[PDB]
Design a protein around this ligand. Structure first.
Ligand code: E4P
Ligand code: E4P
Lengths: 556, 556
């Protein structure tokens, strides 16, 4: 594998092995009054600042230098440039990787197969803008001549989680706009309980599918269409209530949606990077196209920062490099995303997909099997709730867990003269301080003495009260969570994932395990029909099928 | 540490060293046609069956024997009995651990300090039942004399996650119940967006807090009261709209709530084991007291299973042991919970707390630091969505991830003559089969041949399309997700967590690891007030505060 053969990597690993045990966050801060100043990036976007404070990490000057050298040696800059210029860097599928084109506000040419993609990107955006105005204004009427009150996105994975996470995060920008619903699971519960709350007269369905063949999405869409036509009784009416977002015109038409009711995107838009495209229509409908444009613009700002900034002060590069340090040198399996923001409640889940589906890989560009770790398990929940759920383990367990803490300085709801947000901010700050500093036995001993504990009780309790600390974090703080800033933040992590992928020499942009998934259920579906015993498979699969057949009729 | 000095553990470790490299799931099944039969438990509860299929695990007869022996030689049977008898096994806080008393439907006496706890458990349940009758009938009137339409639980962590997860899971059972809302984050967004949708005349607030001092909860509660008083004006009208669930009568009265409107619980009820107590009030209000009793009865059934069953066929014990095997022998940091059920969408998050806050520990009963792993990072999202996202990494990444796949045989919504559920089931079955089997080069090559790939294109793409498999799973299948069955499932994992805690020699029932964060936040809170620079901390904390002070009055 390319990474482990790399001399800069070997140097880094050897340094870690010899020196890492001597790195203590508490001592790093004591020894260097300028630590924050030298290990943070204050980015001015001209529409808010984003401070990336990486000073609470197990790094020093030489470590960062070695990490930056590794990024150079692994050709991060050239690979980045190739992505941006429309090179077919998704080599297993022979595709360009051009989510950056979707938000290319500068409109500079980006060519695929000799042709600039910008005119088609902008044409679709213009179409989205027109449609949103017609729907949000109440001009667009349902089959009984009523304005639309509910938008329902039907899609899964990349055709679901982006629009869901972003509409949740930008909820305060949705005043006046129609309600938005997300149906994704094949589990009939999802569509059933959604439809139960809706009228066919005032619901507009958005069928979101790159391929337009995904089993969950097409089945859900057919169920919705059946429900709709049971009420409307007019195939002509489907045009008023169904829109497709896809690359597959033939399958859209096959389903029963006319191409004029289709907004297209392209093969170089990966699902987990698709919210910027036509797939973002439910966002634009919910918050307005203006705010959707601001979202695109923030991503564009961050794209430019990524493209033009020297590696040593490049925000997504530094986040990627810190990740490499913890993954390939320390061996940390996971990375936690902990936004101190209720609107961001699905942010961690979004990048759980974006990161893991991208970098959960084991074959390189050369076809080699990796002999090192690739992508981490990404997880998290919003603060402060996590403090009362799993922070016990972060503080006092046996796992090293790099954490990104994120918060906006300004809240969307400054209730009680800002009291709630002051408390929220205090916790955000305290938790990373606590993770860094810990509490020494002698410090814990003094507290227990002042608590009036007898010598016997104190000695039994003491070790349980000790916090070993030295637990590293990033703190990412931004002026306010506006559409623009959110766009910038999502793009930042997209580029983090890119840099890690290039360094590991893997393809961040295919998903053969997801493709495998879509082939699997067809072989079992037919066996579930009828009362016949299944002996076809391994005994577990067989035994589970037998249990299912036995139990499906019993009346509880 | 007790575990590492245990000779049965050393034997297990050495077996793993010698034999685990050649342990292959495919081969285990091919060699043993009785595998499913001898590595699964079909539990008949008399109210549905629960099948715990652990056959797709990297274990054989000898491994399971060694694991059972380890449980025995670590004192699991005696420790369990001590829990059930009211022994003060929460040794750092000197408390009993008696969530099993809460759901003790048999009413067998359980003594703490010589007194049976059951009379008081039952008195509170009777009062809970009375509250439910009054609210659900419409007999409970708000300050203008109108029936309650909305219930709002205010609480965090143990006082939030349980009621939230269970009301979500049992949503079909909520016909005729009030709408239920959960406010938990201190983030003002949470209460603000909730209160915007409510009328003070028809809203009942439930302040859920064991201590009745938690900052987030008491602050949210006071904000709710302030909002109410703006409308109702009369401080005596508060008494019709506020109910408390707590152990602290004194603090409840101080807040202004009459004991008439209080439901009590006890110190031996851990927050993360509290949904079975008064804390479950919002569940019982939403789905009715009879369904809440069924939930308790299901847990009770599982309690009896755990108490009476020989270890080698004891469901929570076997789940615990498989976890010990993967954590302490294979070194797997994480454990994924993957319910193929939309109603169970908060199940993984619930046990993220239940597991991680219990077993994220590093000090043993002796006071020694563990020199082995304890609790795993728990995570997951419902199927089938995960198949389109992080399953990419489960299938093709560099991490070993034990997964529990869960599904009901019967769906709550058998739409399209069961079509959706058939597809869901087929995916559930096919994914664990594929995780075990993978896809061989000879299988992948035929697909590339059929696609018309050139010998050279085929050769380059081939390794990307091969799946190594050998990824172990549990399949947990149950007749239907009824209140009873849900109760049994939750209790099962509660007892799994208990067993692992005993084996690690840790206290599953305290949570000292949250203290430091709370201490440091109280110091920072007042520092945020005013324009003056803060220098009392490390430079990162100081610098973040400076950025917050600079950015909070920036107008975007
Ligand atoms: O990579 C995940 C995909 O986004 C998901 O399978 C949906 O695919 P689709 O957009 O083609 O329906
Ligand atoms: O373990 C977490 C606790 O349940 C949480 O902090 C809430 O505590 P409380 O019920 O005392 O408010």
């Amino acid at each position: 594998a390319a990474l482990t053969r790399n001399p800069q990597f070997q140097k880094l690993l050897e340094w870690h092995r010899a020196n890492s045990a001597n790195l203590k966050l508490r001592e790093l801060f004591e020894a260097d009054p300028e630590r924050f100043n030298n290990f943070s990036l204050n980015l001015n976007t001209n529409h808010g600042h984003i401070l990336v404070d990486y000073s609470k990490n197990l790094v020093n000057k030489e470590v960062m230098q070695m990490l930056v050298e590794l990024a150079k040696s692994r050709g991060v800059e050239a690979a980045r440039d190739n992505m941006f210029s429309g090179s077919k860097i998704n080599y297993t599928e022979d595709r360009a990787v051009l989510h950056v084109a979707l938000r290319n506000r500068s409109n500079t040419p980006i060519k695929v197969d000799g042709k600039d993609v910008m005119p088609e990107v902008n044409r679709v955006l213009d179409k989205m803008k027109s449609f949103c105005q017609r729907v949000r204004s109440g001009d667009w009427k349902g089959y009984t001549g009523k304005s639309i009150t509910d938008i329902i996105n039907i899609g899964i994975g990349g055709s679901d989680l982006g629009p869901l996470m972003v509409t949740e995060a930008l909820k305060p920008y949705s005043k006046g706009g129609p309600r938005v619903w997300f149906v994704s699971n094949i589990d009939g519960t999802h569509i059933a309980k959604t439809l139960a709350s809706l009228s066919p007269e005032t619901s507009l369905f958005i069928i979101a599918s790159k391929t337009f063949t995904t089993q969950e999405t097409i089945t859900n869409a057919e169920t919705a269409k059946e429900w709709f036509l049971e009420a409307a009784k007019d195939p002509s009416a489907v045009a008023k209530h169904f829109v497709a977002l896809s690359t597959n015109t033939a399958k859209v038409k096959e389903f029963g949606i006319d191409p004029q009711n289709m907004l297209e995107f392209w093969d170089w838009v990966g699902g987990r990077y698709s919210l910027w495209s036509a797939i973002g229509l439910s966002i634009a409908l919910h918050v307005g196209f203006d705010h959707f444009e601001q979202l695109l613009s923030g991503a564009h700002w961050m794209d430019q920062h990524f493209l033009k900034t020297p590696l040593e002060k490049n925000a997504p590069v530094l986040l990627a490099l810190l990740g490499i340090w913890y993954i390939n040198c320390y061996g940390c399996e996971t990375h936690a995303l902990l936004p101190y923001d209720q609107y961001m409640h699905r942010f961690a889940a979004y990048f759980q997909q974006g990161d893991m589906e991208s970098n959960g890989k084991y074959i390189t560009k050369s076809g080699a099997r990796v002999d090192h770790q690739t992508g981490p398990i990404v997880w998290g929940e919003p603060g402060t709730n996590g403090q009362h759920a799993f922070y016990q383990l972060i503080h006092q367990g046996t796992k090293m867990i790099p954490c990104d803490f994120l918060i906006p300085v300004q809240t969307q709801h400054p209730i009680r003269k800002g009291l709630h947000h002051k408390i929220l901010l205090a916790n955000f700050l305290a938790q990373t301080e606590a993770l860094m500093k810990g509490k020494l036995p002698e410090e814990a001993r003094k507290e227990l003495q002042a608590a009036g504990k007898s010598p016997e009780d104190l000695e039994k309790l003491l070790p349980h009260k000790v916090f070993e600390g030295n637990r590293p974090t990033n703190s990412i703080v931004f002026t306010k969570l506006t559409p623009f800033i959110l766009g910038a933040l999502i793009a930042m992590y997209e580029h983090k994932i890119f840099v890690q992928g290039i360094m590991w020499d893997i393809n961040s942009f295919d998903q053969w395990g997801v493709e495998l998934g879509k082939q699997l259920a067809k072989k079992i579906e037919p066996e579930l029909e009828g009362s016949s015993a299944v002996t076809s498979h391994d005994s577990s699969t067989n035994g589970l099928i037998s249990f299912i057949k036995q139990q499906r009729d019993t009346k509880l």
